């Protein structure tokens, strides 16, 4: 039978006002024989009727993929309301219900620290600008890069990890390729900036600078 998977809104959307967050309910392995899927959304137990549904997206293994999108409010998600997706199909003996929400626990503020590459990394074909994010909670967090105010998009962030104390930590790795424009900006000492967006941050935002020597 099919299988359901429910994703939260992007943390950047949650915190920025003019960005619309949305809880997304995916349905995979929808049979060729029984494609009719039906969704019911619930907030703290109350149906919505607001969400919309993307069309059938056929996949490689001859199955459909139906995706229901429920656009949510910033206050409701941040205040811990449960978003519940009830999928129903003929191939399912019983309907599938999945509930997502804000992580429930003590909120804690991140500490952002930028580390420069080690001298040895410069011989390789790329140098890595590291941005440590430490002691935060919950794991929902958005991390970007930018130099001279312009976003950079060669960065790879790890999944949050549980520290011995309970708070979360992660690293981000902005790859600066050899011969790259982002490299010339780095060697000229231009300002590279690691932006962070998290709930407990005052104004839901802090960013740390970083430059050469």
């Amino acid at each position: 039978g099919p299988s359901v998977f429910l994703f939260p809104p992007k943390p950047k959307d949650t915190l920025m006002i003019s960005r619309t967050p949305e809880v997304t309910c995916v349905v995979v392995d929808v049979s060729h024989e029984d494609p009719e899927v039906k969704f019911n959304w619930y907030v703290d137990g109350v149906e919505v009727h607001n969400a919309k549904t993307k069309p059938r997206e056929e996949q490689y293994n001859s199955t459909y993929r139906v995706v229901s999108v429920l656009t949510v409010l910033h206050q409701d998600w941040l205040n811990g309301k449960e978003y519940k997706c009830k999928v129903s199909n003929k191939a399912l003996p019983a309907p599938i219900e999945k509930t997502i929400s804000k992580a429930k626990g003590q909120p804690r503020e991140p500490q952002v620290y930028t580390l420069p590459p080690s001298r040895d990394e410069y011989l390789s074909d790329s140098v890595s600008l590291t941005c440590l994010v430490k002691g935060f909670y919950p794991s929902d967090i958005a991390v970007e890069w930018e130099s001279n105010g312009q976003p950079e998009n060669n960065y790879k962030t790890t999944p949050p990890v549980l520290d011995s104390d309970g708070s979360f930590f992660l690293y981000s790795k902005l790859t600066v390729p050899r011969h790259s424009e982002t490299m010339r900006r780095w060697a000229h000492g231009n300002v590279f900036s690691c932006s962070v967006m998290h709930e407990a941050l005052h104004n839901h935002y802090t960013q740390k600078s970083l430059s050469l020597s």
């Binding site: 001298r119 011989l123 050899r178 011969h179 790259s180 490299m183 010339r184 780095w186 060697a187 050469l212």
Partner: protein, 563 residues
């Protein structure tokens, strides 16, 4: 603005008349105490002198000469101390001031002095020659104004006139007035006092002024003075400010005094004004006393424990104290000087003889090491060969503790220059800038002169240079990379604020990190060379610093290198 400097151009034809008027305006605007000389000269009939109204004290002398204007509003002037004296004799000098040649109506020349408040002239005398149309200059009885001391100071008053004068106002004492009106009645504060009183507000004993008062007073106390005979210590008139230290009695170890103060002119002050020097003897001055050495901490003078390190003396100082200009006889004296304790003047005789030899354009390169001029810079002549003043391209500060004609720290007149070369200049510590009659000189309004000044009375006076319009035509402008469009000249070297990066003197947009012919590294927006034994790196930085221990790779030594 309470305090302004005076001038020392005594009776010399000002270069440009427009600037002379504006110069006096900028200088005495709102000024109440003239630390120096009040010199009003060559002023035309249609001239406004309202800025002079608030002048109360003049430390030096007062010279009013060669003016077509009809009166000078110096009613609030109470005292003239006369530390300097005109022609080494007079505190007050009123000379000429009359129409010499050819309508409308009215005549030219001064009319009435109207020095209503002037009741004190400590050191000095009076000189009034010619001045047709000058009235009531013989009705004064100056020996009331002259202090008890230096009374013998001369009086020499010409009473030639080209017109007759009315009697004084009937409200005044007979033959006692500065003008035909009642408000011009002469106030008398000496020779009409009780007993041996030098100053008083009346003939009674109770009217006598305190010992320390000058000119007059509002009461018997030292707080009631009109002007302090010596020093103004926080409203009180005293003989000397409190010393900075008091000595032990049994020993004589010096102990710092909280009540100590510094002497600034005739005023006790908690600290010396900007650009002035603080001394151990408790005085603000523009040159250190002899045996002392200038050093910062906050500029200050300290007496030399070891031999006073040798310094460079410019014009107006030491062996050059009486030298007019830089010539072949003294040009070598500035070999490799970073800082010159004096002034620098370049006159047509600099580049001509005086059986001395004329100066040559290459000799001037000596000043390329010069970073600071304490005194002033004056250039009335400069070789047609040279296009600019890049000889002075490393000069950062012209402090102006001395000023040409008492007014201009920087002067540039009558030159075949085409732009200013002073790319390192950041401060005109004092005095005005005068740049006029440089037929080919562009790049003036390109300089952010506002940045260079440090007090209100400073300003740039420019006229008769090449028109800004004419400069735009021909395609002259700051190089692409000059931030805020401020530059001293054309090329990239002449930028004020470099937009991108500095390769020595050039302002360039790309250092040679990543694959430059000689690899480089950045450091505070400066390009600098990687150590030669560092190995050139293709698409990655070559070094973090200047040394051989900061390479990415070597040419051939645990951190260092050794090709």
């Amino acid at each position: 603005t309470q305090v302004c400097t005076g001038t020392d151009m005594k009776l010399r034809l000002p270069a440009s008349p427009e600037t002379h008027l504006d110069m006096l305006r900028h200088l005495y605007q709102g000024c109440q105490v003239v630390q120096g000389n009040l010199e009003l000269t060559y002023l035309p009939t249609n001239a406004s002198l309202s800025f002079l109204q608030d002048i109360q004290e003049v430390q030096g002398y007062v010279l009013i000469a060669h003016n077509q204007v009809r009166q000078v509003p110096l009613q609030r002037l109470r005292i003239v101390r006369g530390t300097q004296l005109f022609e080494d004799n007079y505190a007050l000098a009123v000379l000429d001031n009359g129409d010499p040649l050819n309508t409308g109506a009215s005549p030219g020349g001064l009319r009435e002095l109207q020095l209503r408040s002037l009741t004190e002239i400590l050191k000095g005398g009076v000189l009034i020659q010619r001045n047709p149309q000058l009235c009531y200059q013989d009705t004064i009885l100056w020996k009331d104004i002259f202090h008890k001391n230096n009374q013998l100071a001369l009086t020499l008053i010409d009473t030639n006139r080209s017109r007759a004068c009315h009697p004084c106002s009937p409200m005044c004492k007979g033959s006692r007035c500065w003008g035909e009106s009642s408000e011009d009645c002469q106030s008398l504060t000496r020779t009409v006092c009780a007993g041996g009183c030098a100053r008083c507000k009346g003939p009674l004993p109770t009217d006598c002024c305190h010992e320390q008062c000058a000119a007059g007073c509002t009461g018997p106390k030292h707080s009631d003075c009109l002007a302090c005979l010596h020093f103004n210590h926080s409203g009180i008139c005293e003989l000397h400010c409190p010393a900075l230290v008091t000595y032990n009695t049994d020993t004589f170890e010096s102990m710092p005094n909280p009540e100590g103060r510094y002497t600034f002119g005739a005023s006790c002050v908690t600290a010396c004004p900007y650009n002035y020097l603080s001394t151990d003897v408790g005085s603000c001055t523009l040159v250190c006393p002899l045996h002392n050495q200038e050093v910062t901490a906050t500029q200050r003078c300290e007496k030399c424990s070891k031999p006073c390190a040798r310094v460079c003396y410019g014009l107006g100082m030491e062996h050059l104290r009486e030298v007019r200009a830089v010539t072949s006889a003294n040009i070598q004296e500035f070999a490799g000087c970073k800082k010159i304790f004096g002034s620098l003047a370049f006159l047509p005789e600099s580049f001509d003889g005086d059986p001395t030899a004329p100066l040559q354009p290459e000799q001037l390169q000596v000043f390329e090491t010069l970073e600071e001029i304490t005194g002033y810079l004056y250039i009335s002549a400069w070789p047609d060969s040279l296009p600019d003043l890049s000889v002075f391209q490393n000069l950062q500060v012209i402090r102006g503790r001395i000023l040409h004609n008492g007014a201009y720290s920087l002067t540039l007149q009558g030159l075949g220059i085409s732009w200013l070369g002073l790319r390192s200049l950041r401060e005109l510590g004092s005095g005005l800038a005068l740049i006029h009659h440089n037929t080919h000189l562009c790049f003036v309004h390109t300089v952010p002169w506002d940045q260079l000044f440090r007090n209100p009375h400073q300003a740039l006076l420019h006229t008769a240079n090449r028109p800004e319009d004419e400069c735009v035509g021909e395609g002259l402008a700051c190089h692409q990379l000059c931030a805020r469009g401020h530059c001293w000249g054309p090329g990239p070297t002449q930028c004020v604020n470099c937009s991108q990066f500095l390769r020595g003197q050039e302002c360039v947009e790309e250092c040679r990190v990543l694959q430059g012919l000689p690899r480089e590294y950045v450091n505070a927006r400066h390009c600098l060379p990687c150590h030669p034994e560092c190995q050139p790196q293709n698409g990655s930085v070559t070094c973090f610093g200047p040394e051989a221990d900061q390479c990415v790779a070597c040419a051939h030594d645990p951190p260092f290198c050794v090709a």
